[PDB]
Subunit: 113 residues, 3 copies
C-alpha cells in the first residue's frame, strides 16, 4: 500500500483478530509447498505488543493452511501470510480475507539480545 | 452439551490450557483434509479474553494435526477442533483429550469494526 | 544442557521470540511425520507466564513445519520442537535456529484442576 496496521478492520466488536486479505489472485497446489501471500499491510505494531498471524476457520476448513507467524514489534516490512494448499487446488481471489492478525502483549525478559 | 467453558478442566496447576475432548468417535485419513471435531463445549469467554485452540503434544506426535483456532470473546456457538490426519489413519475415541483451549488477553485498538 | 530458558537469546530488541536451535543434525522426510527435535533447553518459565513454540518464517518457507506447542509454566523437562518436512527432504544442522519461544501471560481461572 504501504498501508499501516491501523487500516485493518475487525469483523465484530468481539473479534480477536484483524482481517488480512490477499492483494493478489493466487492459485495454490499441494506440491507447491508454503507460499508467501502479499497483503500490502506493513508493520510496525503498537508499543509493547507483537503480532500473531493465524488462519480463519472457514479458510482452513476449505483446505488452505495458514502457518502461524510472529510479527515483531519493530518489523517495518510487509506482512505476508504463509499459506499452503493441503489437499486440493486452492484459489485465492484479490481481496479475500485469508488470515487474521492477533495482537498480544510483549513480555520483557532479561535474555541477551 | 451445551456446556460452558467453565466445565473444562486443566491437567495440573501449571497447565496453560483447558482440555478439550471429542464427543464423537471419528476415524480420520490424510486424503480427508481438515475436519471439525465436536466438543459439546460452547463460548463465550471471560471478559477481555479471547481463546486459542492448539493441539496437545502427544496427539500431534501421534499424527493428528490440530490447526490453531481463534475463539472470539463473544462467540456463543460450539467450539470445534479443526483436525487433520497427517500421514496415517488416525482414530479418535469418544472423550479423548485432543486439544487445549488457551485463554489470552484481548487487546483493545482503535481499528474500525 | 541442562540449560535454562534464561540462556536463550533474542534476535533484536523488538523480537517477540527467543531463538531455539536443534542440538542434533537431523534429516527429515515428508513420510516420516512429526519428529521431536532436541534443544538442550529446559523449562520452567517465569512466574505467571506460559510458553508458545512456533516456527521461524524462513524455516517454514523452506518446507519445515513447526507445530505450535504449549510449554506449561511448571514444565521442567526439555523443550522439544515438533517438526515435519512438508514436501521436500529437509536437513537440519546442529545449532540451526529452527523455532522460537514466545512467552505469554498465564491467565488464572476458576476451572477445576
Ligand atoms: O507469517 C509471517 C511471519 C513473519 N513475518 C515477518 C514479520 C516478522 O517480524 C519477520 C521475521 O519473522 P521470523 O523469521 O522472526 O519469524 O517476518 C510475516 O510477515 N509473516
Ligand atoms: O478452531 C476453531 C476456530 C474457530 N472456531 C469458532 C470460534 C470463532 O469465534 C468462530 C469464527 O472463527 P474465525 O473464522 O473468525 O477464525 O469460529 C472454533 O470453534 N474452532
Ligand atoms: O512443542 C512442544 C509442546 C510441548 N512440550 C512439552 C512442554 C509441555 O508443558 C509438555 C506437555 O505438553 P502438552 O501435551 O500439554 O501440550 O510438553 C514441548 O517441549 N514442545
Amino acid at each position: 500500500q504501504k498501508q499501516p496496521i491501523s487500516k485493518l478492520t475487525r469483523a465484530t466488536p468481539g473479534s480477536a483478530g484483524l482481517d488480512l486479505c490477499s492483494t493478489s489472485h493466487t492459485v495454490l497446489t499441494p506440491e507447491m509447498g508454503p507460499q508467501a501471500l502479499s497483503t500490502g499491510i506493513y508493520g510496525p505494531l503498537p508499543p509493547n505488543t507483537f503480532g500473531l498471524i493465524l488462519g480463519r476457520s472457514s479458510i482452513t476448513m476449505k483446505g488452505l493452511q495458514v502457518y502461524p507467524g510472529v510479527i515483531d514489534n519493530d518489523y517495518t516490512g510487509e506482512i505476508k501470510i504463509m499459506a499452503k494448499a493441503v489437499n486440493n487446488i486452492v484459489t485465492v481471489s484479490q481481496g479475500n480475507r485469508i488470515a487474521q492478525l492477533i495482537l498480544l502483549p510483549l513480555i520483557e525478559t532479561d535474555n541477551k539480545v
